[PDB]
Amino acid sequence: MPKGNNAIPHVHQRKHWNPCSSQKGNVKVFFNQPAQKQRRRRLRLLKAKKIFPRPLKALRPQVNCPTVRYNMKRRLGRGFSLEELKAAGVKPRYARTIGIRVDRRRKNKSEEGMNINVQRLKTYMSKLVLFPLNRKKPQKGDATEEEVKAATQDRSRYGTAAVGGLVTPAREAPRKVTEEESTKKMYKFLKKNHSAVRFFRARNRRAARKEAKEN
Amino acid sequence: RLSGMKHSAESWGTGRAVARIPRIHGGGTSMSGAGAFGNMCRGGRMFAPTKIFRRWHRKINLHQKRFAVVSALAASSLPALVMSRGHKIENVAEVPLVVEDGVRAYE
Amino acid sequence: PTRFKKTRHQRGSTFCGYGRVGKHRKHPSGRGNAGGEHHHRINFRKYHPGYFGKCGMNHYHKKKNTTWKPTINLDNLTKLMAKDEAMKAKKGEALPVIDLLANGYSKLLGNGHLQAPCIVKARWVSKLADKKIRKAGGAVVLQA
Amino acid sequence: AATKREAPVPRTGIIAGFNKGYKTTRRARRPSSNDRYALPHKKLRAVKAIISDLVGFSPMERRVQELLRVGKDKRALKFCKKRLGSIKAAKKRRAKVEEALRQQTK
Amino acid sequence: GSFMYLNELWKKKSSDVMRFIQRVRAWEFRHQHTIVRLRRPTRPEKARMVGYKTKQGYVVFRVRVRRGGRKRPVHKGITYGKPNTAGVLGRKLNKNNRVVAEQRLGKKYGNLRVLNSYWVNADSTFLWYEVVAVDPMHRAIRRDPRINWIVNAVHKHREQRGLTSAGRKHRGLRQKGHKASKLRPSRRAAWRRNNRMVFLRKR
RNA sequence: AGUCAGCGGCGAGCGAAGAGGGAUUCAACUCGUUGCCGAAUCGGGUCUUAUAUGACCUCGAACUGUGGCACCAUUUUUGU
RNA sequence: CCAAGAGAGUAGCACUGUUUGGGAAUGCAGUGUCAAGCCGGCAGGUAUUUGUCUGCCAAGGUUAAAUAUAGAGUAGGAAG
RNA sequence: ACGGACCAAGGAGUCAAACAGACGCGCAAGGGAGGAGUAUGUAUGUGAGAACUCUUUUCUCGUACUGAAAGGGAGAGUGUG
RNA sequence: AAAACAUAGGUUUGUGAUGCAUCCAAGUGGUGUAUGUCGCAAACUGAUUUCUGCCCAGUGCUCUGAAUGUCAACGUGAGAG
């Protein structure tokens, strides 16, 4: 066979379920994708057209969201926070009618969220049109101005009324350490904090031993 | 899906004076016993059946795809090349011959 | 592509260059992994030493995100940092501000020797920063 | 139960080492009405008990009871654990028979 | 709600008192034919709470199914095979008896839709479940906009697709994510998923 | 992530989830245990009304169908 | 002036089997056994007791849309 | 020793992962998006898996390793005292 | 196509119906048996004739035998668990 020194024994397609003259079977190519893209697209656009008075995206909260790896990150998450919604004031049911999500399984871990959210909420609202009904009095919420939009077409992305992110940026500092930090010990010393917890821990040395040594 | 491949045909084996392949099952047909399944048989499989993932497809590096074009854009006006390109114009003058955008409205 | 393949070069030729000796039909003489221990031993041992057995210890249902990576070392940072800064702050009368998070990471391990005190809003450090940052009058702010 | 829910947890103040990520601003959770969960919703008790009474006991219940009546009371270690399954349950039965008797006795 | 009593009372299975009740039932079935319509449940509490609400279209069945387990039927009990799935009373039987039961009801007529069913009794022999079955043809029922969902195309049976909660039990549905897992897209579907092939658009 | 999860003559061979990004989504829903109750508030039938409704029987239905309420509430709670 | 009305031979446990990558058990099925002071119940991937602490609140009941079509699918395009 | 009476037309080394080298090829501690999604007319169409892309978020792999672990962790700069 | 088998003829077991024998996925399933020791079942021997020894250690079988070696679950009581 040829002599070439290349990257040992490989190549893969010559394995299981690649339907041969047999049959099988677990098939799911992506070649549909153009079409699919279009399927997403063509539809999406076409959808807009239909819906049309409507701002499309439905307001949801903003969150900082998971993990360590995500500990530092925010995403506009699912749902909302009834509590917040409450805090702005708004009947959830009604909110649903407005097209602002709701939730429950947002259990709502901390303060910040409200704060931010009320502003989000508010902001949408600031940017509210609300359509009334004629004959019937605009009134109910005080639904507004017929010509004002143009409700239709630009569907909308809610991000406009209340945007995504938020963070705080920190700057320039001619100083600090001099007050202190150059003494601040971090050659372990500010490891100590962890250390203690580790060390005194359950099956850990400082809780058992010490106590034992004591009696 | 299974082009060719289709008789309940079996290999006849050895002692039978003959190459030992699959052969058509059935009589009268006068396909009766004729070599089956594969490659070499009439109407059969071919060798290597025609696979679904061919790599009809690719990546291209983005920098690279573009970069390339980028060389090309210059060479869209490296005139000799352009002429050489089957492009001719006796007319030839400024390379590129840069034209009014006013033209665009001509109906 | 078809034309490159050896095959093209190798027709009229039986063996496919496999050897006239070795009429190695289309079978394994081996097959997948296994048999490593008898007939492939020397190879196996040799080329993939440390295998099998299992030993040390384990952490079931481990959830690796939770560990997801944190580490940077020093000079590294400055580079991320605006050069203006990095060609300036040195003195200690301007400590430019670095938020680790954007950089990713979380942990600081030694190395580097920098070229301006600055602030790193940093999450964890080796021993060395007490001897580096600190030595530098550069800075760590641990997060809270 | 409400012994588990009230002005909790002013978490503090910085990551790791017994305190962690952020000095909480511990929102007002949990108005969680599923702490309605039985309690002595009086109804439960009332009914359960009537009927409980109405049915008398189980063979076993009595059986263990005997053990008490003597005082083979590490016994039923088994009965309660095996018969009822699990250690809690065991406990649960244990009260359950015992009580009933003890007060029943007066 | 009297059921509150009823229920608890109903928990008292293991007792003499019950066992009277049981016993009569245990002669009654034991006397009785295999599957019977009922003019009402014998365990209303479950029935009503598994949803029975007093009007036509709601049909009651009591059903008898042999309990026990089963043999792997094989002629003459011989397996060639490699060892593994062996034994006369080998493969144990994945589907549940209730489910079969329901299913057998499902098979039993050319109509009924199991709304659900509950066990009522078992003896040394038979399990009894009292089955809440519905016809989806009564004009009142059909009229009934609450339940009419029942009418629809997916309801050309149900029970054999595994639609009771119990069926769904053997069908495995738990939402506890890491005890929810695999079956969540059926058994199969997920298999199809999980053992997918290299569909990579580009490469 | 074919993975530091891992199973496994532990070998062969196998082997996942969570999160993130993301598509799609304004998606969410009932009953049974709460006084529900001045001839069941129901339903089937009938008959009106051009349907409900009206109406009346039937008689399915007080072994309980309605309505109300449904551990997110109701304001918990107390402003009774 | 108070209430405060949430699913059982099921859950569970043993046992067996089967089944799982799921590990001193991922389920299921059979069989036996068989739960709730409600300071509860369920979950929190090394057995346990034991205790906290952390997340939910099962065991009845319905629910587009985004997905599939995998070979044997049918109306009507587009193609290579 | 086998196979080989004759002539047409057939008739056999494929697709393909990670991966090792080689080589061209891109950029370079980053690189590779990548999933998607948006996006506006050429005008069939269009606001191009495939056109053009185009990309904030980044994602993902890469730009220290070592320890079973618990866990740590590199100018132990150089030089210097 | 026989020196084979069948075969009458020879010999023993097993076995009396809530049974024996026996078929069976299962069922109130089957068959022997629409029947009952002059019965059935089961095997061995192979007309008539004539005779058929010794061995029960072995190895089976058999045993209503013994009874306290053993032999599973199973229970039973015993420690924070």
Contact between chains at A71 and D21 (C-beta distance less than 8 A): yes
Helix (H, G, I), strand (E, B) or coil at E114: strand
CA distance C98 to B57: 43
Task: Measure Cα distances from B66 to B72, C98, E88, E201, E203 in Å.
Answer: 9, 34, 70, 21, 19
Helix (H, G, I), strand (E, B) or coil at D75: coil
CA distance E3 to A64: 47
Task: Measure Cα distances from E60 to A90, C8, E13, E162 in Å.
Answer: 47, 77, 22, 20
CA distance C98 to C127: 20
Q: Which residues of C touch A67 (CB under 8 A)?
A: 65-66, 68
Q: Does the CB of D52 fall within 7 Å of any strand G atom? A: no
Q: Does the CB of E84 fall within 7 Å of any strand F atom? A: no
Q: Which residues contact E165 (CB under 8 A, 6 or more apart)?
A: E116
CA distance E92 to A43: 50
Residue E161 DSSP label: T
Contact between chains at D14 and C123 (C-beta distance less than 8 A): no
Considering only alpha carbons, which residue of chain D is nearest residue C144?
Answer: D14
Smallest CA–CA distance, residue B2 to chain A, in Å, is 5
Q: Which of E121, E120, E152 is nearest to E134 (CA)?
A: E152
Residue from D12, D14, D15, D22 to probe the interface with C (highest C Cβ count within 10 Å): D15
CA distance A69 to C68: 6
Nucleotide G25 C1' to residue E194 CA (A):
23
Q: Which of A138, A55, A144, A131 is nearest to A100 (CA)?
A: A55
Q: Which of E86, E84, E135, E87 is nearest to E109 (CA)?
A: E135
Query: Do the Cβ atoms of C121 and A170 come closer than 8 Å?
Result: yes
Query: Do the Cβ atoms of A27 and A16 come closer than 8 Å?
Result: no
Q: Which of E166, E199, E168 is nearest to E183 (CA)?
A: E168
Token digits of residue A58: 């439905």
Q: Which residues contact D104 (CB under 8 A, 6 or more apart)?
A: none
Q: Which amino acid is at B80?
A: A
Helix (H, G, I), strand (E, B) or coil at E96: coil
Smallest CA–CA distance, residue B44 to chain A, in Å, is 11
Q: Which of A73, A78, A74 is nearest to A105 (CA)?
A: A78
Q: Which residues contact B20 (CB under 8 A, 6 or more apart)?
A: B11, B12, B13, B14
Q: Which residues contact E12 (CB under 8 A, 6 or more apart)?
A: D51, D55, E18
Out of D16, D25, D27, the one facing A194 most closely (by C-beta) is D16
CA distance D57 to D63: 10
Q: Is B56 on the interface with E (CB under 8 A)?
A: no
Q: Which of C29, C110, D47, D79 is nearest to E3 (CA)?
A: D47
CA distance D39 to D45: 9
Q: Is E203 on the interface with A (CB under 8 A)?
A: no
Query: Do the Cβ atoms of A56 and A99 come closer than 8 Å?
Result: no
Task: Measure Cα distances from A142 to A54, A109, A139 in Å.
Answer: 18, 34, 4
Q: Is E175 on the interface with A (CB under 8 A)?
A: no
Q: Which residues of B touch E200 (CB under 8 A)?
A: 53
CA distance A118 to E103: 53
Query: Do the Cβ atoms of E64 and E34 come closer than 8 Å?
Result: yes
CA distance A155 to A161: 12
Helix (H, G, I), strand (E, B) or coil at C60: coil
Q: Does the CB of C115 fall within 7 Å of any strand H atom? A: no
Q: Which amino acid is at A110?
A: S
Dihedral (Cα; D31, D37, D43, D47), 10-degree rounding: 180
CA distance D24 to D14: 10
Q: Which residues contact D61 (CB under 8 A, 6 or more apart)?
A: D93, D96, D97
Task: Measure Cα distances from C91 to C94, C95, C115, C136, C138 in Å.
Answer: 7, 9, 10, 10, 10
Task: Measure Cα distances from E158 to A140, E96, E103, E110 in Å.
Answer: 46, 15, 9, 12
Contact between chains at C142 and D13 (C-beta distance less than 8 A): no
Considering only alpha carbons, which residue of chain A is nearest residue E189?
Answer: A26
Token digits of residue D7: 């002005």
Considering only alpha carbons, which residue of chain E is nearest residue D46?
Answer: E5
Query: Do the Cβ atoms of A111 and A88 come closer than 8 Å?
Result: no
Query: Do the Cβ atoms of A94 and A71 come closer than 8 Å?
Result: no
Classify residue D2 by burial, with Cβ atoms within 10 Å: 0-12, 13-18, 19+: exposed
Count other C-beta atoms under 10 Å from residue A211's C-beta.
10
Q: Does the CB of C54 fall within 7 Å of any strand F atom? A: yes
Considering only alpha carbons, which residue of chain B is nearest residue E201?
Answer: B57
Cis, bond preceding C92 (omega within 30 deg of 0): no
Dihedral (Cα; A38, A42, A45, A49), 10-degree rounding: -170
Q: Which amino acid is at C82?
A: A
Residue keyed to tokens 């349950």:
D89
Task: Measure Cα distances from A99 to A45, A94, A118, E97 in Å.
Answer: 20, 8, 16, 47
Chain E and chain B touch, per 3+ beta carbon pairs within 8 A: yes
E interface toward B at CB cutoff 8 Å?
198, 200-203
CA distance E105 to E113: 9
Residues 55-74 of E with CB under 7 A from strand G: 67-69
Instruction: Say if strands C97-99 and C139-141 run parallel, antiparallel, or are unpaired.
Output: unpaired
CA distance A26 to A23: 10
Partners of C71 in the beta sheet? C107
Query: Do the Cβ atoms of A58 and A76 come closer than 8 Å?
Result: no
φ/ψ of residue E36, rounded to 5: -130, 145
CA distance A86 to A105: 16
CA distance E87 to A12: 40
**Helix (H) / strand (E) containing C133:** none
Q: Is B55 on the interface with E (CB under 8 A)?
A: yes
Experiment type:
cryo-EM
Query: Do the Cβ atoms of A129 and A101 come closer than 8 Å?
Result: no
Count other C-beta atoms under 10 Å from residue A93's C-beta.
9
Q: Is C92 annotated as a binding residue?
A: no
The angstrom resolution of this structure is 5.6
- Alpha-helical regions (H) of chain E: 3-10, 16-31, 44-49, 97-108, 139-143, 165-170, 188-194
Dihedral (Cα; A155, A160, A166, A169), 10-degree rounding: 130
Chain H footprint positions (protein CB, under 7 Å): 10-22, 25-27, 30-34, 36-39, 47-50, 53-54, 57-59, 64, 68-75, 77
Q: Which residue is nearest to nucleotide G45 (CA to C1')?
A: C61
Residue from D43, D44, D55 to probe the interface with E (highest E Cβ count within 10 Å): D55
Smallest CA–CA distance, residue C82 to chain A, in Å, is 12
Nucleotide H79 C1' to residue A178 CA (A):
27
Sign of CA pseudo-dihedral A101, A104, A106, A112? positive
Nucleotide H1 C1' to residue E76 CA (A):
55
> How many helices and strands (H and E) does chain B possess?
2, 2
Query: Do the Cβ atoms of A106 and A76 come closer than 8 Å?
Result: no
Contact between chains at C137 and A177 (C-beta distance less than 8 A): yes
Q: Which nucleotide is nearest to C67 (CA to C1')?
A: F4
Q: Does the CB of E4 fall within 7 Å of any strand F atom? A: yes
CA distance C91 to A175: 10
Helix (H, G, I), strand (E, B) or coil at E38: strand
**Helix (H) / strand (E) containing A66:** none
CA distance D81 to D91: 9
Q: Which amino acid is at D16?
A: A
Query: Do the Cβ atoms of C70 and C123 come closer than 8 Å?
Result: yes
Partners of E199 in the beta sheet? none
Q: Which of E96, E93, E91, E92 is nearest to E79 (CA)?
A: E91
Helix (H, G, I), strand (E, B) or coil at E35: strand
Considering only alpha carbons, which residue of chain B is nearest residue A13?
Answer: B53
Residues in chain B: 107
Contact between chains at C130 and A187 (C-beta distance less than 8 A): yes
Residue keyed to tokens 């059946």:
B49
Query: Do the Cβ atoms of D94 and D65 come closer than 8 Å?
Result: no
Q: Which residue is nearest to nucleotide F3 (CA to C1')?
A: C64
Q: Does the CB of D87 fall within 7 Å of any strand I atom? A: yes
Q: Which of D56, D73, D55 is nearest to D65 (CA)?
A: D73
- Alpha-helical regions (H) of D1-106: 43-54, 59-70, 77-78, 84, 87-105
φ/ψ of residue C105, rounded to 5: 55, -145
Q: Does the CB of C61 fall within 7 Å of any strand G atom? A: yes
Q: Does the CB of A10 fall within 7 Å of any strand F atom? A: no
Helix axes D87-105, D59-70, angle to 10 degrees: 70
Helix axes E3-10, D43-54, angle to 10 degrees: 50
Cis, bond preceding A150 (omega within 30 deg of 0): yes
Chains that touch A (3 or more CB pairs under 8 A): B, C, D, E
